[PDB]
Structures are given as C-alpha cells and as structure tokens.
Amino acid sequence: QINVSFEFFPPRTSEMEQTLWNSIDRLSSLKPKFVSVTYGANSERDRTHSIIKGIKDRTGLEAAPHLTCIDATPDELRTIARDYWNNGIRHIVALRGDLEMYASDLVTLLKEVADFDISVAAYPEVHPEAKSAQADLLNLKRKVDAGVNRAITQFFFDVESYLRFRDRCVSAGIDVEIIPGILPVSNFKQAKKFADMTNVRIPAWMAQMFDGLDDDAETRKLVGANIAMDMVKILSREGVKDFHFYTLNRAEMSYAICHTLGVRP
Amino acid sequence: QINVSFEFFPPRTSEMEQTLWNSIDRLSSLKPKFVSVTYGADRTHSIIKGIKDRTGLEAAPHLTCIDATPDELRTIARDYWNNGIRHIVALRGDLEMYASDLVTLLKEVADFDISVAAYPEVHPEAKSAQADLLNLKRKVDAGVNRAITQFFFDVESYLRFRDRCVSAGIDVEIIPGILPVSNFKQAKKFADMTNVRIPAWMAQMFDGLDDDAETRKLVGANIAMDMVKILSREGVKDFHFYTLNRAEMSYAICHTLGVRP
Amino acid sequence: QSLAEVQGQINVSFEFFPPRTSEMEQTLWNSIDRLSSLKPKFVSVTYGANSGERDRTHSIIKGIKDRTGLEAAPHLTCIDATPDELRTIARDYWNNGIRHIVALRGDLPPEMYASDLVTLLKEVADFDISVAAYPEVHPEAKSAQADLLNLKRKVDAGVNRAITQFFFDVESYLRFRDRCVSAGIDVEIIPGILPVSNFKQAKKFADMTNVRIPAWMAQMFDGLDDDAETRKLVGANIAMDMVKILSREGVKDFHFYTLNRAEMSYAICHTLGVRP
Amino acid sequence: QSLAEVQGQINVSFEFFPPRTSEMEQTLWNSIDRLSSLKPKFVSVTYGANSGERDRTHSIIKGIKDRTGLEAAPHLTCIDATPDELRTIARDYWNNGIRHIVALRGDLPPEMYASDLVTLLKEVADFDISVAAYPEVHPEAKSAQADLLNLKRKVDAGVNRAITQFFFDVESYLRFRDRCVSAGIDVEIIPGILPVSNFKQAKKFADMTNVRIPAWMAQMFDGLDDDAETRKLVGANIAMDMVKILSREGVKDFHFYTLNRAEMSYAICHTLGVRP
Ligand SMILES: Cc1cc2nc3c(=O)[nH]c(=O)nc-3n(C[C@H](O)[C@H](O)[C@H](O)COP(=O)(O)OP(=O)(O)OC[C@H]3O[C@@H](n4cnc5c(N)ncnc54)[C@H](O)[C@@H]3O)c2cc1C
Ligand SMILES: Cc1cc2nc3c(=O)[nH]c(=O)nc-3n(C[C@H](O)[C@H](O)[C@H](O)COP(=O)(O)OP(=O)(O)OC[C@H]3O[C@@H](n4cnc5c(N)ncnc54)[C@H](O)[C@@H]3O)c2cc1C
Ligand SMILES: Cc1cc2nc3c(=O)[nH]c(=O)nc-3n(C[C@H](O)[C@H](O)[C@H](O)COP(=O)(O)OP(=O)(O)OC[C@H]3O[C@@H](n4cnc5c(N)ncnc54)[C@H](O)[C@@H]3O)c2cc1C
Ligand SMILES: Cc1cc2nc3c(=O)[nH]c(=O)nc-3n(C[C@H](O)[C@H](O)[C@H](O)COP(=O)(O)OP(=O)(O)OC[C@H]3O[C@@H](n4cnc5c(N)ncnc54)[C@H](O)[C@@H]3O)c2cc1C
C-alpha cells in the first residue's frame, strides 16, 4: 500500500490559523501514517508544540513535531524530549536547524531518553554546507546509524535527482526508507525563493511552464497540480511507496495528488 | 506552432450568457485558429456575428440537415457566405440526407472552408468500423478541409484511427476534439449517447469525487494536459476544445501546449 | 557496442552541389576523392530550380563518373521545364549511362508535381528513382496526411527510395518512418544527415525548410560564432550521436548533405564502420 | 537537456606539463591564455619524479600566476627528495603564494608514501591539498581494498580533494566513487579526463598505468593512425559523451589532462556550459 504524511507550519495570523485547521480536517480523512509540524525560531517551540497537541486532541493522528538542537542545550533538549514522550508524542523529526550539535547528536540524545520513532532530513541535491556530496552521504549514514526510522528528503523538482540519490543511499548501506518530500507548486515565485535558499534546482521546462502566470492563480494551480501528479506517478512506478507532502498549510493540491495515488478516504 | 479552436454552445440562461461572453473574451487572447458554435438540430447565427463583431476572430457556425430542405440550406449557406462567414462545420445532425450531401451542397454555393465530424470509436449508427471509415472518406472526398473527432479518452484508439484514416486515403487532418472533464457524471452521460468509451482507469480516477468539485477539476485538468502532451509528441499540432462555455480548463491546457497570450 | 558490431552493414550516399568558384571547385574534387574511398552506394549532385544552371550539374556528374567510376545521380526538377524538355533531358541521361535520378519538383519560382516527373521518367526508361520526404511536413502541404499521401502517390509511380529532408530531432524521423508504414509506403525512408559546422547557415536552412532546431542544440552553438574549431567538434558530436541512435533503431542507410565538405561526413561514417 | 541546464554549476581544473622545446612552450602559453578565459578553479603543473627538472615546474607555475592571476598548483613528489628538502621546498612555495599542492609520491626510480608527504606538508602550513586516486587500482597495490585504504590514510592526513587517474570505462569510476563512500572517504572524487586525439600515445599511457581500454574504443580508433582530424573528432565525441554521462550522475568537478593542448578540453567544457 501507499503511505503518506503531511507537513504543516505554525500559523502567525488568525487567518492562517483558520486555514490550517481546515486543511487538517480535510487531509486527516486520508488517514496519513503521520503528520508533522515545522519549527521556526523567529516564527519558538511553544507554537510548534501547541499545534501538535491540537492535532492529537482533535484528530487522534500521530503528530511529529520538528525539533532542532541548534541553540538548545543538551539538558533543555532532554527535558523537552521527556515532556513530549510523557504526553504521548512518540515521533519526532530530529533536525539540527540552521546555524555545537549536529542532528546525529540529537538522535543519540533522543534515543537515550526514550524509544522515539525518529525521522531525519536527507538532501538529494546535497546540503548547502556539506564538505562534499560524499561527506553529506556519510553524514546521513552516521545520522541513520544513531537510530532513525526514516529519512525524508528536501523537496526537489528533478525526479532523477531523487532516484540517483536513493541508489547512492542503498549503495552506502543505508537501509531505512528515503521518503521523497513533495512540494506541490501553486505560487512559483515563493517556490523559487525556497529552492534558491536550499540549493534545489528548478529545471528550465518548469520555470517556462510557470512563465506569464504571475497574476493567474487558477492556471498556476492547474499547472502545478499536473506537475505534482506526474512526478508522484513516476516515483510510484519506480517503487516509491511513501510520500511526504509540504502542504504549506493548504489542502487542495495535496488532497488531489493523494487521490491520483489511490490514497482516499 | 500549435493551432487551437474553441467550441461553444448557445446559452439557455442569463447566467450562462454572461459566462460565455467572458470565456470568449478570455479565450480570444489566445488567438485560436477559429471558434465555432453548435446548432441544436436560431440563436447560433446571432452568436457567430456577435463573436465576429466583438473579437474579429473567424467564427464558424455549425449546420445540420435536421428539419431543413436543400432549398433552405442553400439559402442559409448563401446568407452566411454574404455575411463574411466562410467557414462551416457540416453535420448530418442529431436525430434523409447525410453530412456528405450537405458538403457537396455547400461547396456548390461557394468555396466554403469545411469541417466535418469523425468518430475514432465508430459512430453509433454505423454498420461497422470499416463502413464508418469509408463513409468519412466519402464525406471528405466531397470537399472538406479537416475532420474534427468526437471527444475521446483512450489516446490509443484515437491514434490507431488516425493511422487507419491515412491508410484509407483520407487527405485531411483528424483533429482531436478535447473534452476537459470537471463534471464526470455529465461526461459519463455524454459518452453514453456518443458511444464514447470511458476507460476503467478514468472511472477509477473520478470514483468518490461526486461532491468534490475542486478535486475533480484538478484531476480533469491533469488527464487533459497529459492527453495533449502525448498527442503533441505524436505529431498532432491541432486541437479543438469542447469548452462547454467555460474558459479556465481549456485556457490552462492551452498554456501547457505553449499557446499563451 | 551496437554501433561497433553494425560495422560493415551500412550503406551511404553523399550529396554535393555545383561549385560556384574555383576555390569551391578544388574543395569539391578533394572531398570527392576522399569520400570515394568509402565506396558509397551512390553520390548525387543538386540542381537549383529556376537557376538555369543545369549545365553545371550534368558537368559535375560526368566528371564524377569519369574520375571515380561511382554511380552518380543528378537532381532533376520539373517546376522550371516542360514535359518535352524533361523527356529530352531524360533520354540524354539514359544514353550517357546516368540511370539513377533524384526526381524533384523544385521550389515555386504548378503544371507538374514530383509525382508527374516520376511518371514521365518511367515512360522514358526504367530509371532507378529517389524522391524527397519530409519528416516534419513539407511547408506547402495543407496537412501532414496530405503530404504523406503525396509521398505515396509519388512512390506508387515507380520509386526505389525516399530520402528525407535533414532533421535534428531524431524522434521526428522515427515517428515519420512509422507513419509511412501506416500509409502503405513500401520503400525505405533514408534519413538525410546534415552535419553542422556552420550553425548560422544551418539555422537559415532550417527556418527556410520548416525544420525544427531543438533548444539544447541552439544552446550548444551559442557563443561559437567566431570559433570554427569548437563548432566542428560540437557538430561532429551531435551528428555522430544521431546516427548511432538511428543505427540502433534499424536504419542501415544514410544520405549525407556534405555541402562539398568531406571531413565531418567522413568521420561520421567512420564511427558507423564505413571505412576505406 | 540535463547537460544544458547544468550550465553554470560545473567547476573545472586543467593540468599542464613543463614544455621541453620552444615549440611546446609557445603551444603551452597559447593553451593557457585560451583556457584561462574559462576561469578554472585552478590549474596544475606536473613534475616528473626522478627527473631533477623541478626548476622547470616552479618556473611555469610562477609564470602562470604572473600572466593570469589564476591559482596554480605544482605537483610535488617525495620518492626523489628528503623530508628536509621537501619542507624547504614547501616553505618556499608558501612564502611565494603557492598555497595549493598536488601531493604525490611519484613512480619508484620507499622511505615515504604520499600520505607521509601530506602529513609533512600540513606540519609546514595549512596547504590546500589534492591527491591521486585510482578507480582501477594503482598497479603496485596488493589489493583494491589496500589501495582504497591507502587513499583513506592519505585523506585523513589533511586532504581537500582527490583527483582520479584517467579512465575510459565510466562505470569503473562510478563504482569507485561508491566504494569510496563505503570506505569512509569524505572528499569529492574528481574524475581526471584525458581527451584523446593521439590513440597510440593514450594506449601507451593506459598500459603503463593499468587503465583499461574498452574494445569499442580501440575499434573507434582503428585505421586512424594517419588521420589526425578524424581522430580529434572521434576523440572529442568520446570525451563529450563521458562528461555528459558523469554530469548526469552528479559529478560537478572535472580535471582535464590537456597535454598542453587547449582545443579539445575547451570544447568539452563548452558542452558542459563552462564558457568565457
Ligand atoms: C524533511 C525536512 C524538514 C525540515 N524541517 C525544518 C524545520 O521545521 N525547522 C528548521 O529550522 N529547519 C528544518 N529543516 C532544514 C534543516 O534544519 C537545515 O537543512 C539544516 O541546515 C540542517 O539540518 P539537518 O537535520 O539536516 O542537520 P545535519 O544532518 O546535522 O546536517 C547539516 C550539515 O552538517 C554536516 N554534518 C552532519 N553530521 C555531521 C557530523 N556529525 N559532523 C560533521 N558534519 C556533520 C552535513 O553533511 C550537513 O552539511 C528541514 C529539512 C528537511 C529536509
Ligand atoms: C466536431 C463535432 C461537432 C458537432 N456539432 C453538432 C452540432 O452543432 N449539432 C448537432 O445536432 N450535432 C452536432 N454533432 C453531432 C452529430 O451531428 C451526430 O453525431 C449525428 O449523429 C450526425 O453525424 P455526422 O455529421 O457525422 O454525419 P454523417 O457523416 O452523415 O453520419 C454518420 C452516420 O451515417 C453513416 N453514413 C455517412 N454517410 C453515409 C452515406 N452516404 N450512406 C450511408 N451511410 C452513411 C455513417 O457511417 C454514420 O453512422 C457534432 C459532432 C462533432 C464530432
Ligand atoms: C533529398 C532532397 C534533395 C533535394 N534536392 C533539391 C535540388 O537539387 N534542387 C532543388 O531545387 N530543390 C531540391 N530539394 C528541395 C525541394 O525541391 C523542395 O522541398 C520543393 O519545394 C518540393 O519538392 P518535392 O520534390 O518534394 O515535390 P512534391 O513531392 O511534388 O512537392 C511537395 C509539395 O507539393 C504538395 N503536393 C504534391 N502533390 C500535390 C498535388 N497534386 N496537389 C497539391 N499539392 C500537392 C506536397 O504535399 C508538398 O507540400 C530537395 C529536397 C530533398 C528532401
Ligand atoms: C592526478 C594525478 C597527477 C599525477 N601527477 C604526477 C606528477 O606530476 N609526477 C609524477 O612523477 N607522477 C605523477 N602521477 C603518477 C603517480 O605519482 C604514480 O601513480 C605513483 O606511482 C604513485 O603515487 P601516489 O601519489 O598515488 O602515491 P601513494 O598514494 O603513496 O601510492 C600508491 C601506491 O603505494 C601503495 N601504498 C601506499 N601506502 C603504502 C604503504 N604504507 N605500504 C605499502 N604500500 C603502500 C598504494 O596502495 C599504491 O599502490 C599522478 C597521478 C594522478 C592520478
């Protein structure tokens, strides 16, 4: 069967707060294996923790908060970890965060606290600060060996980048699943900003496909949905049985994509 | 590089009237090779002129052989030709004379640009696939510029037909008629009348979306965009869109084909 | 691997044009001697329609037959001659040993189409005949089916082979070859290969013939206007890749648009296993 | 498509050798000016071990720094010098602005292995260091694991990058790159590319370095001993294909064994999107 998960971010306005819960209600009927909530230091753990508790309380779904260790002391982290665990949060997305402690150190500290289910980040197009592609792979390996359950990739628009990366992970002896993070695109300007700051390559055919649509939201949605549906179709054919969606707190595109994958209520 | 045409139908309500004209405005900016208006086998003629005088686009009215005598047809044919209307979609008509007779008649009145219908999946009345094909050839041999197919969802069937056609000596392009589906129930119905097949994968694709208009449109746009993409790679450079008076889906599909303002 | 094993099973033909200067004349004969060592099935010499320089074409042909003993085929157009002239010209060729003709209509400056020329020629004698094909549709055709149907009409009049217009998108050719079968055309569809060293010139030919130039190719030649060497290396790479792919798809015949130059075509043939 | 979009994300480096004649000297500086316009991350100059011509190497280096302002890396071998000489030579480089060194052992005419040189150099200063790698195993290695383990030892001493021996079988490289990860080697494995125009010479280098030459390649150059032009076109095609494939597999860095010639490397870079 096909497994799916949805990623959300803490809303900063009443309007976005409403949008978020509407999307959670909608997407939850698809019985995702789990949902996660991002962390933004300048946009705090309490906002993240709050949403996580809300999801669990109203939907009963497994909710994984994203926890970063940059700027947090090991002692604080242990306290944080113990509190989430004692309150039913058994899945955590262990991250370093943007610059003392790397994600691998967080994974170790978390496993010392409890048998958490753990998800970590992987980069098909290499982390921007990595010493090299080879190093980035060895580091994911070390991170995995610390005790993780799965790796979720940064978004990508070149499906081949993902496939070659998966083969390299397998050759590297990394046994856990390399779940592709899918970014359905409706706002191309925003996606370009994301890709630029993450070293993700936006192929020419794609940039051309969105050319001239700056003020046409409806066409962007249709074009973006088509691109996303095609990508997951190719991934499925290539054996991918798990997908993680970067919903940006919006449900329509992801819901529709899951539908074409057979993931339905 | 790709030529596109948009088909509309006479609005039956005030709401649909507004919708049509807005779509006409929207779609016109794509400079289609021509637009056409269906004729229920009265208001068709007015819309054509309305379109012509409003956008300057070549508007081709549809004309049938239902409830019309050769004398009346020639009359209409003449009335149209003298009105700057030199392109006509010749059809027998939804139930005497066949479409082939209409074209010979029309050509007899003047050098008319003519579009006729083709049926990749065999016209319902036809005895056999071969008989219907031979019939198309005869209709074309009568003086047609291009054939426009009934909508379809199995690209394979369309392609084999296109192959059979040239093999049968038909010297015109078999332009695929594209039906962007946002309402599956309605399309399911259309297919029942037109004898068009709804592949299993398509039925499974829309299953459970009866009350999800939003997801239906995305799924539909995806199916149609994928279709024209496969078609374009097969050499097809002409598309006729059954817009049902709506602009957004066709507009978006055209965009992916490179047809933009 | 495949291109290596295919060595020895490929036929080739080279196309030349009547030189207009002493410089080009010397270049042409040098290319002829060099390419002759490859033992092409035949070579052909163009004739510009509406040029009135038909004397130059027949001249080069005789010269090639004299100097190399290879079968030389002149390109004959009909848009600029009458059926009687044509028959007269046809008779003269036959009696002089020129038994293979590339029957063409020629660009409009009509009364005759290539198919008429094919019929006319067959009435005169049992010529070996080659005709033009357009994977991307002849620019004047009303439709792709019409153009394709025209090719069948032409072939039915007595044609031994079709030689396509040059193309840069290999799929366009492969699809056309398949559509030719669907149309009942029974002759081999020989791809015409245009090795590119001068992109500006190829670009003009392309836009003049309705031939598409993919973006990746235009990208490859970008910034090379004043770099002839890099152009030749880039072009040879593109040409060699195209024939390798076509060869793997079954093509066993290639017609080269040499533009009177030998090096590029010579090297491409080499990679195809066509050597002295 | 892919090779087209990758344009602008590829780093390149060029390797030269001290000219032995006035002719080669002029050729070298011409190639340097031409290749300099491509803005390579760095260029390097070899030094024949046991040659005693180290003066020529440092000379060319200074000349390149003076004339182009590009980072120039000398190749330093240890099999023919003592630790003191080496440190002395190392100090002189550092004080003259030569902060990048290709640390090599050199062929046996021992007391030192490349890893010792890497340690020695790091004690003198914080040099940027490149070392040799062998996708097809160094000829003296007892086993592939030993050789691979040696590379790790070398890398652990303070290396910024590894540059492989040239190869013609792309899979050999891709597999090696993967085995390097399995061995815990954390530096990028930059493929060294040897464009071939002179096959007889490449053949000698190959058999001299344990590098394999596939049959299809040997087939491609068969019969071209006295045809330099076809050789260059055939070789450019092979080189361009190899980098296209490597580029699609993630390689973003290439080191070219130019043999002091610029045209082939220049054109290959062009197809990689590396332009002036
Ligand atoms: C699915 C996903 C979700 C994310 N969610 C968030 C979020 O909610 N909030 C947020 O702030 N950021 C988030 N990020 C972004 C992430 O925090 C940045 O990419 C960050 O720079 C690195 O985090 P990491 O967990 O990958 O760190 P690491 O795995 O530690 O990697 C970072 C770098 O250090 C190197 N490295 C790793 N381990 C070692 C080691 N032991 N020794 C030396 N070098 C090492 C790596 O090769 C790499 O270049 C997410 C990324 C993904 C792909
Ligand atoms: C692009 C397009 C637009 C259309 N627009 C309209 C519209 O505006 N209004 C409307 O009423 N309908 C419209 N139709 C539908 C059409 O009118 C019906 O399908 C109708 O059944 C008549 O078909 P026809 O025009 O194909 O005529 P024909 O080609 O005359 O008829 C088809 C049937 O008759 C048989 N046949 C044809 N010629 C002969 C012959 N000489 N002898 C014996 N058998 C023969 C064929 O095999 C076939 O079964 C359209 C169809 C298409 C594809
Ligand atoms: C291998 C090759 C070699 C060539 N060599 C030369 C040369 O030496 N000299 C020169 O001047 N040109 C040459 N040409 C170019 C060529 O002459 C032009 O492309 C010309 O415009 C058409 O020539 P054709 O022989 O294809 O004629 P046809 O096959 O007669 O012409 C094709 C055009 O007329 C249409 N057509 C055919 N029959 C009919 C009909 N009965 N009614 C209406 N339309 C019809 C076709 O579909 C098409 O658009 C060559 C082309 C090729 C591919
Ligand atoms: C990019 C590149 C540039 C080059 N430039 C030059 C140049 O300018 N001048 C020149 O003379 N040569 C040059 N060479 C050739 C090179 O010097 C030879 O291949 C040499 O024989 C080994 O050098 P190395 O630096 O790999 O040494 P190492 O890595 O020390 O040597 C490799 C050999 O010794 C074995 N070995 C290593 N450590 C031990 C140990 N402790 N005990 C036993 N065996 C061990 C290895 O497995 C292997 O067989 C170059 C090679 C490359 C790939």
Side-chain angles (χ1 to χ4, degrees), chain A residues 2-13 15-30 32-41 43-52 54-55 57-69 71-81 84-98 101-141 143-159 161-188 190-191 194-198 200 202-207 209-232 234-236 238-251 253-265, chain B residues 2-11 13 15-17 19-30 32-41 44-48 50-51 53-70 72-78 80-82 84-85 87-95 97-106 108-126 128-134 136-188 190-191 193-203 205-232 234-245 247-261, chain C residues 4 6 8 10-19 21 23-25 27-35 37-38 40-54 57-61 63-64 66-90 92-110 112-141 143-199 201-203 205-228 230-231 233-247 249-276, chain D residues 4 6 8 10-19 21 23-25 27-35 37-38 40-54 57-61 63-64 66-90 92-110 112-141 143-199 201-203 205-228 230-231 233-247 249-276:
Chain A
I2 297 178
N3 299 303
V4 312
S5 46
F6 303 105
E7 179 171 309
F8 307 98
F9 70 77
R12 312 204 70 190
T13 62
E15 296 62 36
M16 176 60 74
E17 176 88 18
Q18 187 62 67
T19 301
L20 170 54
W21 296 107
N22 293 348
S23 301
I24 281 165
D25 284 345
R26 191 69 183 302
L27 297 169
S28 64
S29 65
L30 296 188
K33 183 171 173 178
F34 71 83
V35 294
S36 64
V37 174
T38 61
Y39 165 94
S43 69
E44 298 251 344
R45 293 180 299 244
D46 62 343
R47 296 311 286 193
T48 292
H49 177 78
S50 183
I51 302 305
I52 285 290
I55 287 171
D57 288 2
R58 85 146 65 181
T59 71
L61 293 167
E62 178 181 290
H66 290 206
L67 177 67
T68 71
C69 56
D71 220 68
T73 74
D75 286 332
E76 295 176 324
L77 292 167
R78 294 189 182 83
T79 296
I80 294 178
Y84 294 13
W85 172 269
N86 292 309
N87 285 298
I89 304 174
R90 283 67 211 302
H91 183 179
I92 291 178
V93 179
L95 304 146
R96 183 193 67 178
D98 273 345
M101 271 185 86
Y102 281 101
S104 50
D105 300 305
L106 179 52
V107 175
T108 291
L109 173 158
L110 291 174
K111 299 303 289 186
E112 302 183 325
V113 170
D115 189 0
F116 287 100
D117 187 334
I118 302 182
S119 299
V120 299
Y123 310 81
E125 294 163 63
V126 191
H127 181 86
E129 311 186 318
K131 179 205 286 193
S132 76
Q134 298 286 86
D136 206 44
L137 203 49
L138 282 174
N139 291 164
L140 171 60
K141 168 88 169 181
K143 180 157 65 172
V144 165
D145 292 349
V148 316
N149 302 73
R150 69 195 62 74
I152 298 170
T153 80
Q154 176 53 286
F155 64 95
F156 59 86
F157 302 119
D158 174 3
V159 187
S161 296
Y162 167 82
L163 296 175
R164 295 185 299 88
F165 183 66
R166 181 180 64 173
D167 283 355
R168 297 222 64 198
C169 290
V170 166
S171 298
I174 302 178
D175 294 354
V176 308
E177 288 296 314
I178 310 307
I179 304 173
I182 304 297
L183 175 60
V185 175
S186 63
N187 179 327
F188 185 69
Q190 177 190 54
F194 287 159
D196 290 30
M197 58 192 260
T198 59
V200 177
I202 297 172
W205 63 269
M206 184 169 162
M209 190 53 69
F210 281 96
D211 179 62
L213 304 184
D214 289 5
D215 304 76
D216 194 338
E218 186 63 3
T219 306
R220 291 205 305 281
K221 187 187 298 175
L222 297 182
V223 166
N226 176 228
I227 289 166
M229 295 173 168
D230 288 4
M231 199 180 333
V232 295
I234 296 173
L235 290 168
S236 297
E238 295 297 345
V240 175
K241 302 286 181 184
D242 300 85
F243 303 79
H244 187 252
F245 299 83
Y246 295 121
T247 74
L248 295 189
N249 291 355
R250 302 251 69 183
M253 296 193 84
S254 296
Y255 190 86
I257 298 160
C258 286
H259 183 83
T260 66
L261 281 169
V263 180
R264 312 173 183 179
Chain B
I2 304 176
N3 293 297
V4 301
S5 55
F6 303 119
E7 180 176 301
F8 310 96
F9 64 81
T13 71
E15 292 67 42
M16 180 57 83
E17 190 73 38
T19 291
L20 169 61
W21 294 108
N22 289 316
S23 293
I24 286 180
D25 287 352
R26 189 85 186 297
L27 295 180
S28 64
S29 60
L30 298 185
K33 187 160 183 294
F34 72 87
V35 294
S36 66
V37 180
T38 59
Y39 169 50
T44 298
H45 175 65
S46 181
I47 304 297
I48 288 289
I51 296 174
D53 309 316
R54 180 191 184 67
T55 74
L57 294 163
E58 163 176 341
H62 289 209
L63 180 64
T64 61
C65 295
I66 302 304
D67 195 16
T69 68
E72 301 183 301
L73 294 174
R74 300 190 181 75
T75 308
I76 293 174
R78 202 183 309 104
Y80 274 149
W81 183 283
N82 298 313
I85 299 169
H87 180 190
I88 295 175
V89 187
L91 306 139
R92 188 282 293 292
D94 283 340
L95 304 173
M97 61 185 279
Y98 292 102
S100 55
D101 306 320
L102 209 202
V103 289
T104 54
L105 179 162
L106 285 167
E108 184 183 309
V109 183
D111 182 57
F112 265 119
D113 183 359
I114 299 174
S115 305
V116 299
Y119 306 83
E121 291 165 283
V122 192
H123 183 283
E125 281 172 45
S128 68
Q130 193 68 186
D132 196 34
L133 184 53
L134 295 170
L136 173 60
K137 181 179 178 178
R138 173 181 170 63
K139 172 162 55 179
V140 171
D141 291 347
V144 310
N145 301 66
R146 59 195 151 296
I148 302 176
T149 81
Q150 175 64 287
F151 69 85
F152 60 89
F153 298 108
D154 176 356
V155 187
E156 189 179 71
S157 301
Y158 165 82
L159 293 167
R160 250 86 63 66
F161 183 67
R162 186 160 187 265
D163 282 348
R164 248 119 56 191
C165 286
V166 68
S167 178
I170 305 177
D171 63 311
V172 287
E173 177 57 286
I174 314 303
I175 306 180
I178 308 295
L179 175 69
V181 173
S182 61
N183 184 314
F184 184 68
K185 291 175 182 178
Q186 175 180 58
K188 198 75 174 182
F190 284 158
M193 304 166 246
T194 62
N195 207 301
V196 170
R197 192 178 81 81
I198 296 294
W201 64 268
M202 187 176 178
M205 186 73 107
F206 281 90
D207 184 292
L209 297 178
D210 309 60
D211 311 291
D212 192 349
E214 182 53 50
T215 304
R216 287 207 302 285
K217 177 163 55 185
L218 300 184
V219 160
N222 180 56
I223 294 170
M225 292 170 162
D226 284 358
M227 286 184 69
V228 302
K229 184 153 61 61
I230 292 180
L231 291 171
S232 296
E234 288 298 322
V236 183
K237 293 177 165 60
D238 297 277
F239 300 82
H240 181 60
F241 293 88
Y242 293 120
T243 73
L244 299 182
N245 298 341
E248 185 52 20
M249 290 206 282
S250 291
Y251 189 89
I253 298 167
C254 281
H255 178 85
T256 67
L257 280 164
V259 179
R260 307 168 185 177
Chain C
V6 74
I10 305 298
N11 292 308
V12 302
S13 60
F14 304 105
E15 183 175 300
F16 309 101
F17 67 79
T21 69
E23 293 63 39
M24 181 57 79
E25 190 183 2
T27 298
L28 172 64
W29 296 110
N30 292 339
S31 297
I32 287 175
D33 296 331
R34 188 80 186 301
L35 294 174
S37 76
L38 296 192
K41 188 181 178 174
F42 70 89
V43 296
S44 72
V45 177
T46 62
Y47 163 66
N50 311 305
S51 77
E53 290 174 287
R54 188 130 49 201
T57 296
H58 190 173
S59 186
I60 305 297
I61 291 289
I64 289 169
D66 292 357
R67 177 213 262 296
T68 69
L70 292 174
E71 169 180 297
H75 289 202
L76 184 63
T77 55
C78 55
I79 193 61
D80 70 329
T82 65
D84 301 83
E85 297 179 53
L86 294 169
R87 298 187 175 78
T88 298
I89 291 170
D92 296 353
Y93 286 142
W94 184 273
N95 297 318
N96 296 309
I98 323 305
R99 313 296 187 60
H100 179 182
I101 294 176
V102 184
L104 303 136
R105 183 198 68 183
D107 272 354
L108 264 48
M112 291 189 96
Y113 281 103
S115 49
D116 300 304
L117 182 62
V118 180
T119 299
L120 186 156
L121 297 175
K122 275 303 188 179
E123 304 181 316
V124 172
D126 187 42
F127 291 95
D128 175 338
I129 301 177
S130 297
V131 293
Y134 310 81
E136 301 173 76
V137 189
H138 184 286
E140 301 183 327
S143 69
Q145 4 288 304
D147 207 25
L148 196 56
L149 276 185
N150 167 63
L151 181 51
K152 189 183 194 304
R153 184 184 316 112
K154 224 155 54 171
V155 171
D156 288 347
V159 170
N160 300 67
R161 73 191 62 67
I163 300 170
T164 82
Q165 175 60 291
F166 69 84
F167 56 84
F168 294 115
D169 172 10
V170 184
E171 283 186 65
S172 182
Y173 169 81
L174 302 173
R175 291 195 287 93
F176 184 66
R177 185 181 64 173
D178 277 335
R179 295 216 69 198
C180 281
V181 165
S182 293
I185 298 172
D186 72 356
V187 292
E188 220 62 288
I189 308 303
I190 305 174
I193 304 297
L194 176 64
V196 174
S197 57
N198 182 349
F199 183 67
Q201 173 187 55
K203 222 196 311 175
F205 288 160
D207 295 47
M208 180 195 300
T209 52
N210 212 66
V211 172
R212 203 180 74 76
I213 295 177
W216 65 262
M217 187 175 144
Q219 234 283 301
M220 275 290 249
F221 285 100
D222 189 61
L224 303 190
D225 292 358
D226 300 292
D227 192 346
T230 302
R231 287 208 306 274
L233 297 189
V234 168
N237 180 52
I238 288 171
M240 289 171 174
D241 277 4
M242 192 178 332
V243 304
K244 185 192 295 298
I245 301 170
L246 295 166
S247 178
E249 300 297 343
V251 175
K252 315 293 187 60
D253 302 272
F254 299 81
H255 181 72
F256 294 88
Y257 294 119
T258 74
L259 298 182
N260 293 350
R261 294 292 171 176
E263 194 48 58
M264 288 188 83
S265 292
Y266 188 94
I268 292 160
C269 284
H270 178 80
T271 67
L272 280 172
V274 179
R275 310 175 180 180
Chain D
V6 74
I10 305 298
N11 292 308
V12 302
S13 60
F14 304 105
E15 183 175 300
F16 309 101
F17 67 79
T21 69
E23 293 63 39
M24 181 57 79
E25 190 183 2
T27 298
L28 172 64
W29 296 110
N30 292 339
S31 297
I32 287 175
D33 296 331
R34 188 80 186 301
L35 294 174
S37 76
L38 296 192
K41 188 181 178 174
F42 70 89
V43 296
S44 72
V45 177
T46 62
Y47 163 66
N50 311 305
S51 77
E53 290 174 287
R54 188 130 49 201
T57 296
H58 190 173
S59 186
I60 305 297
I61 291 289
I64 289 169
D66 292 357
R67 177 213 262 296
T68 69
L70 292 174
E71 169 180 297
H75 289 202
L76 184 63
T77 55
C78 55
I79 193 61
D80 70 329
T82 65
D84 301 83
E85 297 179 53
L86 294 169
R87 298 187 175 78
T88 298
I89 291 170
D92 296 353
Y93 286 142
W94 184 273
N95 297 318
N96 296 309
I98 323 305
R99 313 296 187 60
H100 179 182
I101 294 176
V102 184
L104 303 136
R105 183 198 68 183
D107 272 354
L108 264 48
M112 291 189 96
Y113 281 103
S115 49
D116 300 304
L117 182 62
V118 180
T119 299
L120 186 156
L121 297 175
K122 275 303 188 179
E123 304 181 316
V124 172
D126 187 42
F127 291 95
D128 175 338
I129 301 177
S130 297
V131 293
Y134 310 81
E136 301 173 76
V137 189
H138 184 286
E140 301 183 327
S143 69
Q145 4 288 304
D147 207 25
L148 196 56
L149 276 185
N150 167 63
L151 181 51
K152 189 183 194 304
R153 184 184 316 112
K154 224 155 54 171
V155 171
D156 288 347
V159 170
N160 300 67
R161 73 191 62 67
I163 300 170
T164 82
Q165 175 60 291
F166 69 84
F167 56 84
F168 294 115
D169 172 10
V170 184
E171 283 186 65
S172 182
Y173 169 81
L174 302 173
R175 291 195 287 93
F176 184 66
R177 185 181 64 173
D178 277 335
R179 295 216 69 198
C180 281
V181 165
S182 293
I185 298 172
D186 72 356
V187 292
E188 220 62 288
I189 308 303
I190 305 174
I193 304 297
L194 176 64
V196 174
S197 57
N198 182 349
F199 183 67
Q201 173 187 55
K203 222 196 311 175
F205 288 160
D207 295 47
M208 180 195 300
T209 52
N210 212 66
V211 172
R212 203 180 74 76
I213 295 177
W216 65 262
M217 187 175 144
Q219 234 283 301
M220 275 290 249
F221 285 100
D222 189 61
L224 303 190
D225 292 358
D226 300 292
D227 192 346
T230 302
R231 287 208 306 274
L233 297 189
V234 168
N237 180 52
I238 288 171
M240 289 171 174
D241 277 4
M242 192 178 332
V243 304
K244 185 192 295 298
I245 301 170
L246 295 166
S247 178
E249 300 297 343
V251 175
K252 315 293 187 60
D253 302 272
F254 299 81
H255 181 72
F256 294 88
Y257 294 119
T258 74
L259 298 182
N260 293 350
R261 294 292 171 176
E263 194 48 58
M264 288 188 83
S265 292
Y266 188 94
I268 292 160
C269 284
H270 178 80
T271 67
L272 280 172
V274 179
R275 310 175 180 180

